[PDB]
Design a binder for this molecule. Structure first.
Ligand SMILES: [Br-]
Ligand SMILES: [Br-]
Length: 120
């Protein structure tokens, strides 16, 4: 479904995503640090919603939009496409490490949203 549905998977997935991304092209070392902050913010938002018994698919979706727009600010600052494709690759690898099943629609949606927010 979405790695955000379970607060524990959310954190494991995000950690693997950031671990993977650190070896990929497109981002400077300082941009990777900014991505990490964005990634922590997202995990924390998911976890806080869940802890308070306030989560819902629609709140999780809006957080995903905020997450992509935040990434896009960095991705838009190698090129946008090198960064976007690296995000997709690190996410794919993170799925394999965590769920063992790649959620390609999620990956594609993220790349789509990051590209969309960037061109604004
Ligand atoms: Br890794
Ligand atoms: Br409870």
């Amino acid at each position: 479904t979405t790695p955000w549905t379970n607060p524990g998977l959310a954190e494991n997935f995000m950690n693997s995503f950031m671990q993977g991304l650190s070896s990929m092209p497109g981002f400077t070392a300082s941009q990777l640090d900014d991505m990490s902050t964005i990634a922590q913010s997202m995990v924390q938002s998911i976890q806080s919603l869940a802890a308070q018994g306030r989560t819902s698919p629609n709140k999780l979706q809006a957080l995903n939009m905020r997450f992509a727009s935040s990434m896009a600010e960095i991705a838009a600052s190698g090129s946008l496409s090198t960064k976007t494709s690296s995000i997709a690759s690190a996410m794919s690898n993170a799925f394999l490490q965590t769920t063992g099943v790649v959620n390609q629609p999620f990956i594609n949606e993220i790349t789509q949203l990051v590209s969309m927010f960037a061109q604004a």
